[PDB]
Every structure is written in structure tokens, then in C-alpha cells.
Design a protein around this ligand. Structure first.
Ligand code: HEC
Ligand code: HEC
Lengths: 131, 131
């Protein structure tokens, strides 16, 4: 009926990976020729994936390697769900602000908001992603 | 950024897999009971990834397996770029309408727009993806 553990692991990893491509495209525009419409579209993807409810992909047996599929989540992610929830809400707030300032076309304002979204990816990885 | 072949195949598959999870959530809501806010967030992911410039992920060298990174794109894709462009434009128009209508909360209107984006996904798979 619903997604199996191994499918939930592949899907959250797809979501994270797609955000990474869009993060790299904003960094490449900030350093080379800034194209405001390309940054806006990339920022829009990060805000949409941050609001997508990825919490639903951390269901019961997804704390371990299942089949052919390997997870890098640390077991502490489960057991610290209020802390996870708070970092997650700091991340949708930073992701929503990037989308809003990307819409102004001003690269300097985008540099700052991008730095704050980066911070939020990093603080969750630091505590909850292995090795 | 200017990605390697490996990274282009891995990212395009990650975008598609994440759009499939969100399409599955809209069908679940249409068949079970509708949570309007859930459908809006899933619809906005589809339109943001449709608008993200994934055409950039079908560069040279990406038409075959690169190392042990496997791809399911048929060689035909790369021969028929005019047809791929036609399909891809109608896909982002349809994905744009799905996010526009899902924002109203009107389940019956979401039902036909969802069918249009679905049609656009299988039309490209029928011609250009192995199986
Ligand atoms: C927790 C609240 C997280 C936030 C916010 C972000 N990421 Fe993360 N990420 C997290 C975990 C627990 C994991 C491991 C998932 C697993 O099941 O293995 C990850 C993983 C990634 C990956 C690797 C995906 C893969 O190919 O296997 C990437 C590229 C990644 N994360 C990127 C990323 C970015 C760019 C973020 C902010 C925009 C971001 N993540 C936030 C946990 C969390
Ligand atoms: C062509 C113009 C396409 C449109 C529109 C959509 N898809 Fe597709 N998809 C396409 C190709 C050529 C491939 C293979 C890519 C590769 O390098 O292997 C795919 C693949 C998928 C996948 C599997 C990805 C994976 O992780 O291996 C899924 C789940 C998928 N496609 C879904 C999907 C959905 C739901 C679409 C519409 C909303 C959609 N695709 C559009 C080409 C095209």
C-alpha cells in the first residue's frame, strides 16, 4: 500500500541530492555571471523541497540499511525528534527567505540568504548524518 | 554548475524520483481524503522541478552508462531534440497549471490537471525511457 523502507531511503536521498544541484547553481551564479531568473528558479526548488514534508520519509525501519540500500542517517535522528523538528523549521524559514530575496534579483541580498540556507543544511548534517 | 556525466545522470534521476513521490501523494489524496495543504505542497514541488532547467542535465557523454552509474534514457532522446522540446514545454505548462489549481483547494479541478501532468510524464517515458 505505501512506500517500503528502502524506497523511503532512496526518495529522501533524491530530494537532498536535487537540492544540492540547485545549491551549486546559486553558488556558480554568485561567483560568475549572475543570471537572476536562473537563481530564482533554483531558489524556488529549495523552498519547494523544504516545504514538501520529507519528515514522512523517515518512517519506522528506515534507520538501517535495508537490502541493497544504504542510509547515512544516525540513529539519534529518531529519539531526538523535537531537536530535528526545530532544525527543520529553521531550514524552511531560511529556504523561504532565499526564495523571497531571489525574487528581487539583487545578488548581494542573495549571498546572505544563501549563506543562511547553507548553515542550516550543515547543522543538521553535523548532528544527524553519519561519518 | 558544469557537471560531470555521472553527476548529470544521478541528478536527473533524483529530480524524477522526487517528482514521482510527490505525484503519488497527490493521487493518494484524490483517492482517500483530501488534505488541500498537502496537495499544494506536492504540486509546488512538481512545478519547481519542472521549471528547474533539467534540460541542462542531458549533456554530452550522458547517453550511456558512465562507470557504474546506469541510465535508462534511450539513444533516441538525443536524436529527437525537437520532439523532446515539444513534450518538455507541454510538461512544464501542465505542471504550472497543477500548482495554480492545487492552490485553490478544489479537488475536482485538481483531478483533471493532475491527469494532464500524468499524461505528459508517460508520453515522454513511452518514447524515451527504456521499458
Ligand atoms: C535535517 C533536518 C537535514 C536538513 C535540513 C538537510 N539535510 Fe542533507 N541529509 C540529512 C540526512 C539525515 C542525510 C542522510 C540521508 C540518508 O538517508 O542517507 C542527508 C543527506 C544529504 C545528501 C546526500 C544524499 C545522497 O545522495 O545519499 C545531500 C546531497 C544532502 N543531504 C544535501 C543537503 C542540502 C544541500 C541541504 C540544505 C539545502 C540539506 N541537505 C539539508 C539531513 C538533513
Ligand atoms: C521527458 C521529456 C520526460 C518527462 C516530461 C518526464 N520524464 Fe521521467 N524520465 C525521463 C527519462 C528519459 C528518464 C530516465 C533518466 C535516466 O537517466 O535514467 C526518466 C526517469 C524517471 C524515473 C526514474 C528515475 C530514477 O531514479 O532512476 C521516474 C520515477 C520518473 N522518470 C518519473 C517522472 C514523472 C512522475 C514525470 C512527470 C511528473 C516525469 N518523469 C516526466 C524523461 C521524462
Amino acid at each position: 500500500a505505501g512506500l517500503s523502507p528502502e524506497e523511503q531511503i532512496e526518495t529522501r536521498q533524491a530530494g537532498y541530492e536535487f537540492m544540492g544541484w540547485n545549491m551549486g547553481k546559486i553558488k556558480a551564479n554568485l561567483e560568475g555571471e549572475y543570471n537572476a531568473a536562473q537563481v530564482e528558479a533554483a531558489a524556488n526548488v529549495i523552498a519547494a523541497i523544504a516545504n514538501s514534508g520529507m519528515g514522512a520519509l523517515y518512517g519506522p525501519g528506515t534507520d538501517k540499511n535495508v537490502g541493497d540500500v544504504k542510509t547515512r542517517v544516525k540513529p539519534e535522528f529518531f529519539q531526538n525528534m523535537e531537536d530535528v523538528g526545530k532544525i527543520a523549521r529553521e531550514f524552511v524559514g531560511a529556504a523561504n527567505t532565499l526564495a523571497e530575496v531571489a525574487a528581487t534579483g539583487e545578488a548581494e541580498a542573495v549571498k546572505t540568504a544563501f549563506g543562511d540556507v547553507g548553515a542550516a543544511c550543515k547543522s543538521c548534517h553535523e548532528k544527524y548524518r553519519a561519518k
